[PDB]
Design a protein around this ligand. Structure first.
Ligand SMILES: CO[C@@H]1O[C@H](CO)[C@@H](S[C@H]2O[C@H](CO)[C@@H](S[C@H]3O[C@H](CO)[C@@H](S[C@@H]4O[C@H](CO)[C@@H](O)[C@H](O)[C@H]4O)[C@H](O)[C@H]3O)[C@H](O)[C@H]2O)[C@H](O)[C@H]1O
Ligand SMILES: OC[C@H]1O[C@H](S[C@H]2[C@H](O)[C@@H](O)[C@H](O)O[C@@H]2CO)[C@H](O)[C@@H](O)[C@@H]1O
Ligand SMILES: OC[C@H]1O[C@H](S[C@H]2[C@H](O)[C@@H](O)[C@H](O)O[C@@H]2CO)[C@H](O)[C@@H](O)[C@@H]1O
Ligand SMILES: [Ca+2]
Ligand SMILES: [Ca+2]
Ligand SMILES: [Ca+2]
Ligand SMILES: [Ca+2]
Length: 404
């Protein structure tokens, strides 16, 4: 049994009294909902309030989310309920606190009295000429324009970041990682940190653009997109590795599929069309996150069909990740809890068997592990396709779930 929960949104840093402190009052509901892992925001001091422009990595007390004490309390509380904590690891780039003799912000400060993470421009990818001194290695991945990109090929960088990561575990209590902008560096570099810090899991944000047709809608065939993701997992270590990926392929397809085009939810082989269909054990599914939904809304899920999104991921293979807003602010708390209960009660896991029974425009009906049947779509009657012995267990707007 494994169910992730993103414990924050793009507005969380603004929370009166501290986000982590507020979250203490949410722990019980999250645990009772069957959640096993809670993804928390970048914990270190960051130039940007949301934390995605970290500077002093060890300076937890400078976070807009709360200080080290408050964070440890939250993680302690989650652990008290058997829930693990995933830290949002942002290491592709990093902001330098001080200027060098060139007037360039490239003198880093780790947050401790010694030289830990006290890097200089030699640790900045040389091809990031806005900050580099030309002495480092070339970036192993894409660049983040607003800040120095870190040369992960640098020996000291690997050593110290790994030491820091282990510190997040031993000192704060974190159990696993969420790798931010993993396209910023190679899967080989991700391998170094994953293999070197033994997290329970390391879900990477490998976000590639999804191919679309002349009408702007994603193509039915998204194999190129999920193949990239499968390849990333293979290169990071495959099955043996704790590494995994957010199922963006499923996210893009599902975004479109619910708009009366549920025929998109199956490939020519009869499997789920996203990563879920090729490597479910490595596919972390989701309806929306702080980037796609929330106040950034880069790729929101049709707001009137969100619960269909959850009926889908919460009953299917792959590791579903619930979004904070949907659970506490949209009023789906009880329905989402009930869907997880169904998943758990039936022993459904990321690798459960998926047998799709119907995949028409306004009706998708699938059977998981021969124990749970789920349906989404505007078509009301699908009773003819419901296997014998199944009885409705949960239902809502354009979705229903049966149990046997
Ligand atoms: C008005 O608001 C609406 O609320 C609705 C209920 O939540 C949903 S419909 C939603 O859930 C439905 C199940 O409650 C299914 S219909 C689905 O399941 C049915 C029950 O197993 C069967 S059989 C059922 O038998 C009744 C007694 O014999 C009979 O009177 C009914 O006509 C018959 O449905 C049915 O065959 C099967 O299709 C929907 O598919 C789900 O979408 C609305 O979405 C929501 O707007
Ligand atoms: O199932 C785990 C398996 O996943 C892939 S093999 C994958 C291939 O990438 C895809 O093009 C083809 O259509 O389906 C197969 C099976 O899902 C990975 O490469 C491999 O290491 C892993 O064992
Ligand atoms: O905003 C349009 C949308 O509004 C609700 S969905 C959702 C809303 O987006 C969110 O800001 C708020 O926190 O929760 C509501 C649901 O409780 C409406 O249900 C939907 O039909 C409409 O399209
Ligand atoms: Ca220092
Ligand atoms: Ca950069
Ligand atoms: Ca980003
Ligand atoms: Ca980079």
């Amino acid at each position: 049994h494994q169910v992730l929960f993103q414990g924050f949104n793009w507005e969380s840093w603004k929370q009166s009294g501290g986000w982590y402190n507020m979250m203490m009052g949410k722990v019980d509901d999250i645990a009772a909902a069957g959640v096993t892992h809670v993804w928390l925001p970048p914990p270190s001091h960051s130039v940007s309030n949301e934390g995605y422009m970290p500077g002093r990595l060890y300076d937890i007390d400078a976070s807009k989310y709360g200080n080290a004490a408050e964070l440890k309390s939250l993680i302690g509380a989650l652990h008290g309920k058997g829930v693990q904590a995933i830290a949002d690891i942002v290491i592709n780039h990093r902001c330098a606190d001080y200027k060098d003799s060139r007037g360039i912000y490239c003198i880093f400060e780790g947050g401790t009295s010694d030289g830990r993470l006290d890097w200089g421009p030699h640790m900045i990818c040389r091809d990031d000429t806005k900050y580099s001194d030309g002495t480092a290695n070339l970036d192993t991945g894409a660049d983040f324009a607003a800040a120095p990109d870190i040369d992960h090929l640098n020996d000291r960088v690997q050593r110290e970041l790994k030491e820091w990561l282990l510190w997040l575990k031993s000192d704060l209590g974190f159990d696993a990682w969420r790798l931010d902008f993993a396209r910023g560096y190679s899967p080989e570099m991700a391998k170094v940190y994953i293999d070197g810090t033994s997290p329970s899991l390391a879900v990477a944000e490998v976000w590639d653009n999804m191919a679309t047709g002349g009408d702007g809608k994603p193509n039915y065939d998204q194999d190129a997109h999920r193949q990239n993701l499968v390849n990333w997992v293979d290169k990071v270590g495959g099955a043996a590795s704790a590494g995994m990926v957010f199922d963006f392929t499923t996210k893009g397809i599902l975004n479109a599929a619910v708009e009366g085009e549920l025929w998109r939810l199956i490939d020519p082989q009869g499997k789920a069309p996203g990563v879920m269909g090729w490597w479910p054990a490595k596919a972390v599914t989701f309806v929306d996150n702080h980037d796609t939904g929330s106040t950034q809304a880069m790729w929101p899920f049709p707001s009137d069909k969100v619960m269909q999104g959850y009926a889908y991921i919460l009953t299917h293979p792959g590791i579903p990740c619930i979004f904070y807003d949907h659970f506490f602010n949209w009023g789906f708390k009880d329905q989402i809890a009930a869907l997880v209960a169904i998943r758990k009660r039936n022993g459904i896991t990321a690798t459960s068997a998926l047998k799709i029974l119907m995949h028409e425009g306004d009706a998708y009906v699938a059977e998981i592990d021969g124990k749970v049947v789920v349906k989404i779509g505007s078509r009301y009657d699908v009773g003819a396709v419901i296997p014998a012995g199944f009885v409705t267990s949960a239902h809502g707007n354009d979705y229903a779930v049966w149990e046997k």
